[PDB]
Design an enzyme around this catalytic site. Structure first.
Site, short mmCIF file in Angstrom:
data_model
loop_
_atom_site.label_atom_id
_atom_site.label_comp_id
_atom_site.label_asym_id
_atom_site.label_seq_id
_atom_site.Cartn_x
_atom_site.Cartn_y
_atom_site.Cartn_z
N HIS A 1 29.58 137.67 91.21
CA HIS A 1 30.21 137.09 92.25
C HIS A 1 29.40 135.92 91.22
CE1 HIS A 1 31.00 139.04 95.81
NE2 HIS A 1 29.45 139.17 95.57
N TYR B 1 34.46 145.31 101.10
CA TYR B 1 33.84 146.04 100.52
C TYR B 1 35.19 147.39 100.35
CZ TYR B 1 29.66 144.00 100.99
OH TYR B 1 28.61 142.44 100.72
N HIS C 1 27.98 143.96 90.11
CA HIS C 1 28.28 143.51 90.88
C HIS C 1 27.73 141.91 91.19
CE1 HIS C 1 29.50 143.02 95.22
NE2 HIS C 1 28.54 143.03 95.53
N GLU C 2 26.53 141.42 91.13
CA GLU C 2 26.08 140.38 91.68
C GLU C 2 26.37 139.50 90.58
OE1 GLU C 2 25.15 139.76 94.87
OE2 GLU C 2 24.67 141.59 95.22
N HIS D 1 17.44 142.61 100.32
CA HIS D 1 19.50 143.07 99.98
C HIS D 1 19.80 141.81 98.49
CE1 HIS D 1 23.15 145.56 100.68
NE2 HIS D 1 23.40 144.79 100.34
O1 LIG Z 1 26.08 145.00 100.36
C1 LIG Z 1 25.90 144.70 99.31
C2 LIG Z 1 25.91 143.83 97.88
C3 LIG Z 1 25.86 142.86 98.87
C4 LIG Z 1 26.86 141.38 98.73
O2 LIG Z 1 26.89 141.37 96.66
O3 LIG Z 1 27.50 142.17 99.01
C5 LIG Z 1 26.59 140.08 99.12
C6 LIG Z 1 26.04 140.95 100.62
C7 LIG Z 1 25.47 139.16 101.27
C8 LIG Z 1 26.29 138.68 102.06
C9 LIG Z 1 26.38 136.96 102.88
C10 LIG Z 1 24.57 136.99 102.58
C11 LIG Z 1 23.75 137.44 102.83
C12 LIG Z 1 24.26 138.84 101.46
N1 LIG Z 1 27.30 139.29 98.99
C13 LIG Z 1 27.12 137.81 98.74
O4 LIG Z 1 25.62 138.19 97.05
C14 LIG Z 1 28.28 137.20 98.61
C15 LIG Z 1 28.07 136.23 97.62
C16 LIG Z 1 28.92 134.98 97.75
C17 LIG Z 1 30.23 135.52 98.52
C18 LIG Z 1 30.53 136.73 98.22
C19 LIG Z 1 29.34 137.71 98.82
N2 LIG Z 1 26.83 145.76 98.58
C20 LIG Z 1 27.10 146.60 99.70
C21 LIG Z 1 28.41 147.75 99.36
C22 LIG Z 1 28.30 148.52 97.86
C23 LIG Z 1 27.26 149.93 98.74
N3 LIG Z 1 26.97 150.43 97.09
C24 LIG Z 1 26.95 149.63 96.41
C25 LIG Z 1 27.30 150.16 95.00
C26 LIG Z 1 28.23 149.27 94.24
C27 LIG Z 1 28.39 147.96 94.33
C28 LIG Z 1 29.40 147.78 96.07
C29 LIG Z 1 28.28 148.13 96.71
C30 LIG Z 1 25.87 147.33 100.42
O5 LIG Z 1 25.60 147.49 100.13
O6 LIG Z 1 26.32 147.73 100.93
ZN LIG Z 2 28.75 141.35 97.00
#
Ligand SMILES: O=C(CCC(O)(O)[C@H](Cc1ccccc1)NC(=O)c1ccccc1)N[C@@H](Cc1c[nH]c2ccccc12)C(=O)O
Ligand SMILES: [Zn+2]
Ligand SMILES: *[C@@H]1O[C@H](CO[C@@H]2O[C@@H](C)[C@@H](O)[C@@H](O)[C@@H]2O)[C@@H](O[C@@H]2O[C@H](CO)[C@@H](O)[C@H](O)[C@H]2NC(C)=O)[C@H](O)[C@H]1NC(C)=O
Ligand SMILES: CC(=O)N[C@@H]1[C@@H](O)[C@H](O)[C@@H](CO)O[C@H]1O
Ligand SMILES: *[C@@H]1O[C@H](CO)[C@@H](O)[C@H](O)[C@H]1NC(C)=O
Ligand SMILES: [Cl-]
Ligand SMILES: [Cl-]
Length: 582
Positions: free
Chosen positions: A347, A481, A343-344, A313
């Site tokens: 961040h 989100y 998206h990443e 993930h």
């Molecule tokens: O989870 C993510 C991407 C992962 C993340 O970048 O949000 C990640 C999640 C995470 C958080 C904490 C620990 C491990 C994983 N968050 C980060 O990389 C992050 C880094 C610094 C600060 C805040 C978040 N997206 C969500 C929402 C989503 C779905 N489809 C999409 C398409 C485009 C954009 C977002 C989404 C998902 O897949 O359900």
């Molecule tokens: Zn994110």
């Protein structure tokens, strides 16, 4: 007093930078190489950072914030006062830390196997099936199998997890873990504000829903789709039916109107690195920061082939030394993953923009902002015009226009109720109104209520579908989100205007607009130092969250959909709400 506070914060900062950097390093090694050793070391480092958190938090609690003049220092101290998990007694803390690790590893190594045949992992195999198969039985197999192996397996850990994270919250002055999470927005009206935004995009979602249902009716048969009931959850092109653009081919408004962007990327030589490089170039085209050389050397931009087990993930990493930032993504070559890469990268841009703030303030204006940055740019990258500049496409008509709007909506609009749903379920779990005996039934009731979806096969005791969604066992909040999907349009709207764009908002591409870049950078640099409405105002000119930008973006599609659905006598919603498939 004031002098002691200024000194405490300075010491907290220099020491947290060291302790957080060390923890990140151990966390990174576990995430990119799941083994007993890396696991054991991560658990050990958990206690180290907890020691540090307990030490500074205890001292922070002795000061009197509100009787303190400086606003920055008052904010930093208030934050340090929250020991989060470090508030739990040694025994409970250990147990908690172990439960979180066990859930994460259970989710990241789960596989679905064919009897004495092949075993598939979520990424890239199961996700590829959900995205490309058009066979009801094959999609069901992957959808059910994933819940059987990942969700069922997370169930044994969840009640304890809930018990312990709630206990941590109470020890920190909150009523439950949900209340604690909610507080990250510093917005008393948050629950009602979000409910209003949800209700705002309702007309748009119900119309998209009805239209997609009719198309599924066409392809899968009247015997499997109720035109007045919920949609079977395994048919939307994504394991969680959270984004639907992978079934675009089944719903194309104007079939006579694009090429295969995947085939183009693959034959044109695109690779994970090139995908991240293109995102990098887009940020710098806006006058924003390029990622450092180190990023390319230490990131994990694709799933390893050396036998290592990893957490696929996607996630972005700040190592708290303002120099080392990385992404860990099992990137596949296609448009959907390119959006995720963008998206990443947002961040990462945020990390680089506030890297000079005390570490306590190195956070997004609110968690939703952090999630939004990256998506704002991907909206521009997704336009037909920008994709043709990337040679990925060979439009211009109104039919081409509606097709693009549909593609975008299948992702952006469908995601609104899903993203709203997740924490509505967890807040109710955390506050105690949903007991373990009802975990799954309540999940489906919300799935039905908000998304208009139903399970393709009945669920039974022992099923724990929430467990099969990364964020649940990973303990990562999700309302961020929902907020992101709303506000990214507000930012796109503002940036397009700052870039001088005129005409339909969806035709905007901010590529190379220094103005747009400056709009974001100013707000990104603030980190968590000021209340979020202020960052909101710097970017857009007003202090609220608003669904108007999004509606404005999709206005043409809403009008087309209403007309199209009315022509077919569609009945919006799911009157026959108890309907389940075969
Ligand atoms: O989870 C993510 C991407 C992962 C993340 O970048 O949000 C990640 C999640 C995470 C958080 C904490 C620990 C491990 C994983 N968050 C980060 O990389 C992050 C880094 C610094 C600060 C805040 C978040 N997206 C969500 C929402 C989503 C779905 N489809 C999409 C398409 C485009 C954009 C977002 C989404 C998902 O897949 O359900
Ligand atoms: Zn994110
Ligand atoms: C309130 O304090 C901030 C932060 O001061 C810094 O951090 C302290 C813990 C201590 O180490 C101080 O010596 C530091 O100066 C002040 O804001 C900083 O102002 C300077 C100079 O304008 C600037 O370089 C920093 O960017 C600012 N930091 C932040 C977070 O804004 C601020 O001026 C003080 N406010 C008042 C009203 O006195
Ligand atoms: C590049 C750099 O040195 N940044 C530091 C930052 O690490 C520290 O937290 C802050 C104190 O507020 O002072 C900045 O100058
Ligand atoms: C993965 O972790 C194991 C156990 O710590 C270690 O022996 C091995 O060298 C690591 N593999 C890589 C690619 O670093
Ligand atoms: Cl589910
Ligand atoms: Cl959040």
């Amino acid at each position: 007093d004031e002098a002691e506070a200024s000194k405490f914060v300075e010491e907290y900062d220099r020491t947290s930078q060291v302790v957080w950097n060390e923890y990140a390093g151990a966390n990174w090694n576990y995430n990119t190489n799941i083994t007993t050793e890396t696991s054991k070391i991560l658990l050990q480092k958990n206690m180290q950072i907890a020691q540090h958190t307990l030490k500074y938090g205890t001292q922070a609690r002795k000061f009197d914030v509100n009787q303190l003049q400086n606003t920055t220092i008052k904010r930093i101290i208030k934050k340090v006062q929250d020991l989060e998990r470090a508030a739990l007694p040694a025994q409970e803390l250990e147990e908690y830390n172990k439960i979180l690790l066990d859930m994460e590893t259970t989710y990241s190594v789960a596989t679905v196997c064919h009897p004495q045949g092949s075993c598939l992992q979520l990424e890239p195999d199961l996700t590829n099936v959900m995205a490309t198969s058009r066979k009801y039985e094959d999609l069901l197999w992957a959808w059910e199998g994933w819940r059987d192996k990942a969700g069922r397996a997370i169930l044994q850990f969840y009640p304890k997890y809930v018990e312990l994270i709630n206990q941590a919250a109470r020890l920190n002055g909150y009523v439950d873990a949900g209340d604690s999470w909610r507080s990250m927005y510093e917005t008393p009206s948050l629950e009602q504000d979000l409910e209003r935004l949800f209700q705002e995009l309702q007309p748009l979602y119900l119309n998209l829903h009805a239209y997609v249902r009719r198309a599924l009716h066409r392809h899968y048969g009247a015997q499997h789709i109720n035109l007045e009931g919920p949609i079977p959850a395994h048919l939307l092109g994504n394991m969680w039916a959270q984004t639907w653009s992978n079934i675009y081919d089944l719903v194309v408004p104007f079939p006579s109107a694009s090429m295969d962007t995947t085939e183009a990327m693959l034959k044109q030589g695109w690779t994970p690195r090139r995908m991240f490089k293109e995102a990098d170039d887009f940020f710098t085209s806006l006058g924003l920061l390029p990622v450092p050389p180190e990023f390319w050397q230490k990131s994990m931009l694709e799933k390893p082939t050396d036998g290592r087990e990893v957490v696929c993930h996607a996630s972005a990493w700040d190592f708290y030394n303002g120099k080392d930032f990385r992404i860990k993504q099992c990137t596949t070559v296609n448009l959907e993953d390119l959006v995720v890469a963008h998206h990443e990268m947002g961040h990462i841009q945020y990390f680089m923009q506030y890297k000079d703030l005390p570490v306590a303030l190195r956070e997004g204006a609110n968690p939703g902002f952090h999630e939004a940055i990256g998506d704002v740019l991907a909206l521009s990258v997704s336009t037909p015009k920008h994709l043709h500049s990337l040679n990925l496409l060979s439009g211009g008509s109104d039919e081409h226009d509606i097709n693009f709007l549909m593609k975008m909506a299948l992702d952006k609009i469908a995601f609104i109720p899903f993203s709203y749903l997740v924490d509505q379920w967890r807040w109710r779990v955390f506050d105690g109104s949903i007991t373990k005996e009802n975990y799954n039934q309540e999940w489906w009731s919300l799935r039905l209520k908000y998304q208009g979806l139903c399970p393709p096969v009945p669920r039974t005791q022992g099923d724990f579908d929430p467990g099969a969604k990364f964020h649940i066992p990973s303990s990562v909040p999700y309302i961020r989100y929902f907020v992101s999907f709303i506000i990214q349009f507000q930012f796109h709207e503002a940036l397009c205007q700052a870039a001088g764009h005129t005409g339909p908002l969806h035709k905007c591409d901010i590529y190379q607009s220094k103005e747009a870049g400056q709009r974001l950078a100013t707000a990104m640099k603030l980190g968590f130092s000021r209340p979020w409405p202020e960052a909101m105002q710097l970017i857009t000119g007003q202090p609220q969250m608003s669904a108007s930008a999004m509606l404005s973006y999709f206005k043409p599609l809403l009008d087309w959909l209403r007309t199209e659905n009315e022509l077919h006598g569609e009945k919006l919603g799911w009157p026959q709400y108890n309907w389940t498939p075969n």
